[PDB]
Amino acid sequence: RLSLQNTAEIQHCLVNAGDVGCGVFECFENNSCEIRGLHGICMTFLHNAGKFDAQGKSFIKDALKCKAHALRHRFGCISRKCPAIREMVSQLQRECYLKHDLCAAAQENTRVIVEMIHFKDLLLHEPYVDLVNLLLTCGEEVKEAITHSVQVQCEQNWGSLCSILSF
Amino acid sequence: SRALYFSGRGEQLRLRADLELPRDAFTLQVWLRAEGGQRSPAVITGLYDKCSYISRDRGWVVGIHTISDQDNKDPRYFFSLKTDRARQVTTINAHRSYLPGQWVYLAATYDGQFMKLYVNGAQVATSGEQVGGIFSPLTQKCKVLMLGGSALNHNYRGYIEHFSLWKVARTQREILSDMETHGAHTALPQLLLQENWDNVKHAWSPMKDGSSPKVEFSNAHGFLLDTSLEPPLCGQTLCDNTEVIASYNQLSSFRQPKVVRYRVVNLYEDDHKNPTVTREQVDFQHHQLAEAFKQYNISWELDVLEVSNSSLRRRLILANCDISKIGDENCDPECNHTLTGHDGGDCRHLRHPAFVKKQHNGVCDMDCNYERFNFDGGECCDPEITNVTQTCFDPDSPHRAYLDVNELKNILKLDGSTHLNIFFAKSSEEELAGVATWPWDKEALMHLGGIVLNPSFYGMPGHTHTMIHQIGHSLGLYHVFRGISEIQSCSDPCMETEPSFETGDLCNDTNPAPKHKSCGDPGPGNDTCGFHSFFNTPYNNFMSYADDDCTDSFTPNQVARMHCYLDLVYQGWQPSRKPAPVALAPQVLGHTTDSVTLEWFPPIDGHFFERELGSACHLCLEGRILVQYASNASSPMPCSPSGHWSPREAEGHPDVEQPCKSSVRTWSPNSAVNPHTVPPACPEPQGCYLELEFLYPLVPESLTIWVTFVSTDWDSSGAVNDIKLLAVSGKNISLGPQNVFCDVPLTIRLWDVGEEVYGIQIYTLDEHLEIDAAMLTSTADTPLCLQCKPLKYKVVRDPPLQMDVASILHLNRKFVDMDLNLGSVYQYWVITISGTEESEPSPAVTYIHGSGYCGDGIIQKDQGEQCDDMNKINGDGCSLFCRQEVSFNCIDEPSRCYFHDGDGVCEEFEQKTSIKDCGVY
Amino acid sequence: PVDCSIPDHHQVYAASFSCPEGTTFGSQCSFQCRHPAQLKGNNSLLTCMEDGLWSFPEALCELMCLAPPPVPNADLQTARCRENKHKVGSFCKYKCKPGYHVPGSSRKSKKRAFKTQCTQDGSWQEGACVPGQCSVPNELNSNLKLQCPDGYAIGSECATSCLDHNSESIILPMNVTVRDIPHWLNPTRVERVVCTAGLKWYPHPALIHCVKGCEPFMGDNYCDAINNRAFCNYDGGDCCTSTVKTKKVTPFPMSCDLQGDCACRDPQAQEHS
Ligand SMILES: *[C@@H]1O[C@H](CO)[C@@H](O)[C@H](O)[C@H]1NC(C)=O
Ligand SMILES: *[C@@H]1O[C@H](CO)[C@@H](O)[C@H](O)[C@H]1NC(C)=O
Ligand SMILES: *[C@@H]1O[C@H](CO)[C@@H](O)[C@H](O)[C@H]1NC(C)=O
Ligand SMILES: *[C@@H]1O[C@H](CO)[C@@H](O)[C@H](O)[C@H]1NC(C)=O
Ligand SMILES: *[C@@H]1O[C@H](CO)[C@@H](O)[C@H](O)[C@H]1NC(C)=O
Ligand SMILES: *[C@@H]1O[C@H](CO)[C@@H](O)[C@H](O)[C@H]1NC(C)=O
Ligand SMILES: *[C@@H]1O[C@H](CO)[C@@H](O)[C@H](O)[C@H]1NC(C)=O
Ligand SMILES: *[C@@H]1O[C@H](CO)[C@@H](O)[C@H](O)[C@H]1NC(C)=O
Ligand SMILES: [Ca+2]
Ligand SMILES: [Ca+2]
Ligand SMILES: [Ca+2]
Ligand SMILES: [Ca+2]
Ligand SMILES: [Ca+2]
Ligand SMILES: [Ca+2]
Ligand SMILES: [Ca+2]
Ligand SMILES: [Ca+2]
Ligand SMILES: [Zn+2]
């Protein structure tokens, strides 16, 4: 259900916005298919990139580049219907992060990734959900760390409801 | 006489410093044939200062640049000048966008207080801002006169012939005299330069980089009796012209009986049962058609076509519906229908979440057959599970239950060039029963054109005059309520305020009427604008929306339109082999003490050669040059390996109503995709390409491409990255990037191509560029046009020619009468002989030898001459028929016409209309 | 009366105008050619004419270059250049004296001759003519390591390595320590050390400190502060707009100040020109 005018403006965005940084993700936001969070992933990663180590700075150099470039191409003749777009974005996350070894970089900066991930931001944006899911299969120690943080944040924000859902 | 061709790639000339350039006053005079798609700006010639390190704008420049610089759209001739003493540069322009491929006498003068620009001798611009001399004698060595472009690569592409430069300003009579000499050479004291290009190196040295333009033999300076007759503002073809249509109106010999064949497409089941229309329908409708058309000299020959195809018969044929609009989640009532899934579900909402269980069931039911449920995943479109003809509602499955008439027309591939095809559909609208192709479309004679009707409204008592309405549409008749209900707005420039030949339905005898269904006179307040009430409306005319019980007649002007279009376009339908007549009376060129010269127009259909079936000569023009449009068209399917595809909108003659606006009648890379799919970007630097093939491969001479729309942003590549000529032997000559204008057809000359070219490939990096059509013009005496015989004209005079002339026949459309007596009245008409069958006589011209006429240079006001310029060319202000053109005022005798709407001087008759000069009234 | 207005530089180029009588019809403003432009003609008065535009000048301020200055250690080759009459664009050839060569000449071909041009402002374009064993390195930096495959014999070369693989062993100027490095200073890279005949290491290990080498992020369109220094290509031109390929500056991380460390520090940028 991607609006035709919305599609036109996004298409003109991509050919103009540069690869580096996240000018690309900027106006892929506000899309008619409600897909939000790519630009948030950019800002979260870029702001917290100062806390990453040498390997982490490499990962942020090249994973953001993969997603920018791939969203400039996979947004080719993909179906105008929303479910196809959500799948295209999801596959961007999986392929870009896995190709660039998300697991080991996250293992080097577990304490950082825990700070970056927010329970609130997790619910608002689907790309965040794919990010945390890929982290869960990136080492038992890291997955344990993520579980600790997510339950405490959910418990504070939801009160007894979080404990009810956390069987 | 020789002419320079500037290829636009860097060939420039520079006048040698031996000549004393003019300081105080000057006059440039150059014949030129500019091509389409120039670089903006394109300096034809200019005076430049080579010493001014800071202000290069000093000096003057004559060239072609776009008015409305934002979205370069309107390329006009221009004259810029900045004297050494002035503060700003001053630019004046022509009245209209230049015409590519036409010889134009561009003359520009400056007398020291008034700079003026003349196009074909009619003063089109004037400015008094620049005062004083151009440059002081001290700076005389610092001025260089350069032709073909500036040193800044403001290059010009096209022909330049007989450059001339005076050191005085020439009044309009002097420039007109110099134009009529047509390159004749003579030395005058005020002549600095006169160039016949016999020796370019003698006077002009090429600019640096050593690229000099080529020197051809000029085909001609011009042609007497300009035969180019443009239709009016509303009109579309030569039959909308007031002069042409007057001949069909006044004369009764132009409406002789004509038999026109029409074919009825009757679909059938495989067992030859269940007709789409019963034989009673065809017989009854044919009888009613014959009765209505009997009195108007049109009789229809009935051919019935039985197609026994259940796979076509059982499906629902749709009219006015577009398959792309089904399932787009936007409600489309015209594609509503039971077998289309109510627009594929766009127009049918319900408690959808209550149907999740029915998914994955493996059996078709009803609720899952929609686009948001994805049509049950193809269970319903499977012939094995269920029954497609009532279950396969999807617009993508080839087994869908509905077609549209465009696909039905594609399937049948009927010969539309010899019959009027009557297809049958299901018109959902209560307004019309179908769509009839206009005579001025591509498909008028192709397999995709004809008439689509509703079988429920065909041959039924009370519904028979819907086919006669549609037939009138297919013969060029507009709706009588055009101009009020079919106008764009109340400010439409040719809305029919009063009965006229140039507004509305282009039929005077049909009063303005609104879109009204009852055949009483419309009531007060039934007007969209409400400016005037309607009286004596043609409520009973076939072209009105009244019921079949009251519509009974065509007005005599509408009958004239139908017969004009039966000679212009539909010569193929009629079995009669009478060639089309000459529409206009033989014009009088000039008279001597003992003779008179007559030149007449070609026959109205426009063909100069005898019509032979199967030959290519119906495309040949005078001089045996073959001009053809893109027949094939193919362009790779985007984001698909191979894909092939076939963009039929870029075939045939150009059909875009309004250039520079996005249209559906073009090839656009974005249009190549499924509308339910994000359009890709054109591949990097090769571009999306459109292949156009031409029916008759031949040695090309010039290529014309109608680039209707261009996105406005990038550079000067013109969005046409490359053009390749597919040679027959297998080569492919690349022509390099071309500059295009959105409203001027990109013209290219192919003098370098020596091999037979069968097609082109228009590459583009633009995802929004739109190509309307192409055109190949052959060289003179092309092989295919040699054998076919030419049309021959026979001239008949009243009184008859004294010697027993057999008319000696004719081929040149020029007759010199030697036998004349002073003061005697003579009448002339021409009869077109195509083999041995003579056409109807052309309208007569009455020339009284020794007296005046139209085109003698004397304004005989009694004859009706509003102007007279001793000349038979339109566009010089005074029309061919001795009538002032719009926005041109003509003074003196013979007439000197000038463009007054913005000549820098307000006048008496300009006060009420011209705000540019006289201000707000 | 019609106003010709104060005459601008457009009436006569490279001159100043005095208008004692004003700028009205019939006025006459006298022009003087500014140095070094020389007046050529017989009148220098511009009349304000009836059309509203200053009259034509009867004379012009010709631009010219006087005798070029004698370039040190160079001999003029063009005799005509010895005059005091050279128009704009005139070339003068100089030949360096023996034992001298033009700076910027390649080693394979030392050009002993050059040319200069009379530039538009009346000056001349510049041109010149340019003519046992060794002690164990006990005093070493913690991050610095020395590898000696050939022992410590006089003349043996020991490789200087750093604990950080992205750190370079260098020697800074005496006025600049490890943390005192300015943006404009490019330290001397040191790779090997040689013990001389004086029983001493040269350069001394105590003078070598492992300074953080820049990360491989050079030339990735990401202006990062660490690589933004003269030691390595100012982050490969990422931090300066003209040098970067994308023509836009996106500092990494975002928090880096565009007016601070991530500011364009390369002095060869067009913004610095
Ligand atoms: C029909 O044709 C006859 C000649 O056969 C002519 O006299 C008459 O004017 C024509 N009428 C119309 C309406 O075309
Ligand atoms: C009928 O036309 C269709 C095209 O729509 C074609 O596939 C088929 O072979 C034709 N004949 C029959 C008997 O269906
Ligand atoms: C389609 O037809 C159905 C049934 O006639 C109707 O309810 C629906 O409004 C129609 N869709 C349109 C008008 O687009
Ligand atoms: C499809 O329709 C035909 C009509 O004759 C009928 O014979 C056949 O049984 C139907 N098949 C299904 C699966 O409905
Ligand atoms: C046009 O029609 C009007 C009546 O509406 C009539 O008076 C006039 O003579 C007609 N003129 C022509 C040229 O047919
Ligand atoms: C049209 O051109 C395409 C591509 O060159 C070709 O495959 C096809 O056969 C052509 N068709 C005709 C009718 O010439
Ligand atoms: C065009 O010509 C070039 C050689 O100039 C050749 O490589 C190419 O295959 C030809 N065809 C096209 C479509 O480019
Ligand atoms: C130049 O000016 C002088 C006065 O200063 C006058 O005597 C002489 O005639 C002038 N010469 C020319 C060539 O005008
Ligand atoms: Ca729809
Ligand atoms: Ca179903
Ligand atoms: Ca009318
Ligand atoms: Ca077209
Ligand atoms: Ca006359
Ligand atoms: Ca004329
Ligand atoms: Ca005027
Ligand atoms: Ca960097
Ligand atoms: Zn109609």
XYZ file of C-alpha atoms in Angstrom, chain B residues 53-54 58 84-87 131 133-136 138-139, chain C residues 5 8 10-11 13 49 51 53-54 56-58 60 120:
28
model
C 39.060 40.637 -19.537
C 36.128 41.422 -17.216
C 30.028 43.643 -24.734
C 30.456 49.785 -24.928
C 28.588 52.622 -23.186
C 25.475 50.808 -21.957
C 25.045 49.260 -18.513
C 21.547 53.875 -27.525
C 27.522 53.308 -31.011
C 28.526 49.713 -30.419
C 32.208 50.476 -29.857
C 34.665 53.337 -30.148
C 39.994 52.946 -30.448
C 38.769 49.432 -29.586
C 26.026 58.578 -12.455
C 32.517 52.928 -12.571
C 33.480 49.818 -16.672
C 33.917 53.194 -18.406
C 39.426 49.742 -16.885
C 26.087 62.636 -23.130
C 21.488 59.564 -24.041
C 25.628 57.210 -20.859
C 29.198 58.431 -20.474
C 33.507 57.050 -25.398
C 37.008 57.453 -23.914
C 39.475 58.862 -26.440
C 42.946 53.775 -23.000
C 47.534 41.109 -15.320
